[PDB]
Amino acid sequence: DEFEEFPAEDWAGLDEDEDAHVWEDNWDDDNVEDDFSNQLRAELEKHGYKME
Amino acid sequence: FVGTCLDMCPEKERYMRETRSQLSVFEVVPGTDQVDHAAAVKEYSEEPLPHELRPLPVLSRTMDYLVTQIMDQKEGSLRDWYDFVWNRTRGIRKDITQQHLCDPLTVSLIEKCTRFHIHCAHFMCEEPMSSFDAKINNENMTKCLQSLKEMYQDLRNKGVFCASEAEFQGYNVLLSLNKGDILREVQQFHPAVRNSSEVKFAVQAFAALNSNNFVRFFKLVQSASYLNACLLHCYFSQIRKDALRALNFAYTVSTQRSTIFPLDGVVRMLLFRDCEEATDFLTCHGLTVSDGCVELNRSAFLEPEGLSKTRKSVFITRKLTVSVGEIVNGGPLPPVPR
């Protein structure tokens, strides 16, 4: 796992490429209806502590 | 060059000790003057000729006589006991350091000396400045653990294992928690060493430090052995400050109210001896512990400085049912060496 050196010493600004939208913040939202959250919907509502 | 020394004692240096009057009061004949020819074991002050250096079986018999009788007696003052045994164990370490002969029995001579250093890292903490000097003790301990770390690599590449290999690697991890480089070290252990019982205990202690999980630290220190518990006495002034800072921050409304925090829970999470140590510990920091419960206020809390002297934490010396001699040996003792 050694960082091998580059074939070219110099390159222009258009030589590199990216995927534009990678590191996004859309996950901090209010989606409750995911399946894993349904599974906890058993366990928090099996101990008699239930709320909407 | 190997030696042919066949004596417990120096053969010449006891006479120079007797003339120049630099004796140790623990090992003399009763009635001063004469040196004890039975026990006047080597002082540390190229190494020439086959005196002043001993081969491995004589030196092993020296370590056996050191562990069976010398560390058990409480005769004399407590000033020179640590100096006597520390100087002689450092003399043994200097002896086999430049002798350049290695064996699994030689590793046990490192093991008993570093167990003595772990035991004296807590027991002699109440000694006043000139007698103990804990800085040079913590300095001396890390050379032993570094030499043991580099020593275990050599026999592993040779192709022989040891039963006591995975034990002190846990103590190597418990030595350096404030240095974050050591995680790279725990990516470089052997898989059988890494998947053992006590290295994963050390991972739990390192996770208890950096996540500041003080509940799974003092509850973790009660589930360990004696030496593992008394090595963690250096971090008690760090954990109990990094834990109470969050607990004097997370209970207030802005900066100006008081959260009445009751007693017998602070001694339950933070491992104190009793109420008497806890009130003295929280009075000096700047908050109020008087009357019924512990006060909490943001503005009336400041960082400490100056004298930060420690005590013996009581709970870690409760797990010392066997005596002082058999801890650094491990299990039983060989009886009557002569």
Binding site: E5, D10, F36, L40 | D181
Partner: protein, 364 residues
């Protein structure tokens, strides 16, 4: 065939050429002291005689003699390069003497790697001294990229601090060769992921990820392997498309487990992968942000301002994490309060956490 080599090293000195290094001295082409000492001056020709004797040593595969060769090569070229009086034209020759004593310096099996480290530090302490055109410090960034690469494999990087601060304070910091500019703050981002400096690693190695050549398709992957948990601890997690395109699918379910124990199962299903690259203990520190996301899943499921601690106790009790009780759940929440992830205060008299209502807890 020797006379052509003597002619091209004579024209190397006479015409002050920089391509003559790639012509003779470099180990990229097809490759007796008394003859050169007859024809040339001693600091300029001991290079060539040593080079003949250690190409002979490599030609029958002896590495210790070639190691002593390249020690003599770097020392004699250091003495002849101080015997230059401020010119730039030996700086191409500076390139092929340090890189070739990295792969021959690694292969002598450690202490030989520390020996190569100190004798190459002796090269840097003479190279970084003297001096806007005639400056002998243009290859210095080439030199400092090697001193990370020796120091990382030996695992004795206890103090690298004055070696970094000397070149961090520099007038020419934004102008070098851009191939060596990528290879520097990659290692600075390594030293910044370690000992808890995660923002510096993110900026200095996101600069590397935004750049670099697309021809070598191993550098971009090796950046990602060591890039991803920096931005998982910072918060801004990858998408599915980059992991699909670059075939890096081990972290992806982990990026599910951070999003909503599933984390321990996902870590232990590929337990032998993060040990090899040295990621595994860094990845355990995401317990705080996964507990904060579990706090989000509790807060959106029950919808009030004051929540009782027994529900979070049950939610930790499903996880099969050992020795979790009522005092442990009360501790992590105060750590979330102090570091600033979760606003509010832990009431002890009612055992209920009152949270703020305008913003519940800040985003990242």
């Amino acid at each position: 065939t020797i006379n052509q080599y003597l002619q091209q090293v004579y024209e190397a000195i006479d015409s002050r050429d920089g391509a003559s290094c790639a012509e003779l001295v470099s180990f990229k082409h097809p490759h007796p002291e008394e003859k050169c000492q007859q024809v040339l001056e001693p600091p300029y020709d001991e290079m060539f005689a040593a080079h003949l004797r250690c190409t002979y040593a490599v030609g029958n595969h002896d590495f210790i003699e070639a190691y002593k060769c390249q020690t003599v090569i770097v020392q004699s070229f250091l003495r002849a390069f101080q015997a230059h009086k401020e010119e730039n034209w030996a700086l191409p020759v500076m390139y092929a003497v340090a890189l070739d004593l990295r792969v021959f310096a690694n292969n002598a099996d450690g202490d030989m790697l520390e020996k190569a480290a100190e004798l190459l530090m002796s090269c840097f302490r003479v190279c970084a001294s003297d001096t806007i055109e005639d400056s002998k410090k243009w290859g210095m960034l080439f030199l400092v990229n090697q001193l990370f690469k020796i120091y990382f494999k030996i695992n004795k990087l206890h103090l690298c601090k004055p070696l970094i601060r000397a070149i961090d304070s520099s007038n020419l910091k934004d102008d070098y060769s851009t191939a060596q500019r990528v290879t520097y703050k990659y290692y600075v981002g390594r030293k910044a992921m370690f000992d808890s400096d995660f923002k510096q690693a993110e900026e200095y190695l996101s600069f590397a990820f935004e750049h670099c050549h697309r021809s070598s398709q191993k550098n971009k992957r090796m950046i990602l392997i060591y890039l991803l948990p920096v931005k998982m601890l910072l918060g801004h997690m990858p998408t599915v498309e980059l992991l699909k395109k670059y075939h890096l699918m081990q972290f992806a379910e982990v990026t599910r487990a951070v999003s909503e124990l599933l984390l321990h199962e996902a870590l232990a299903k590929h337990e032998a992968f993060f040990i090899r690259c040295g990621i595994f203990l860094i990845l355990e520190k995401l317990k705080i942000i996964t507990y904060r996301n579990l706090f989000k899943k509790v807060y959106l499921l029950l919808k009030t301002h004051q929540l009782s601690l027994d529900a979070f106790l049950v939610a930790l009790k499903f996880m099969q994490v050992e020795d979790v009780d009522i005092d442990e759940v009360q501790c992590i929440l105060a750590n979330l309060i102090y570091m600033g992830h979760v606003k509010g205060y832990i009431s002890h008299q009612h055992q209920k956490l009152v949270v703020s209502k305008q913003n519940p807890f800040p985003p990242l």
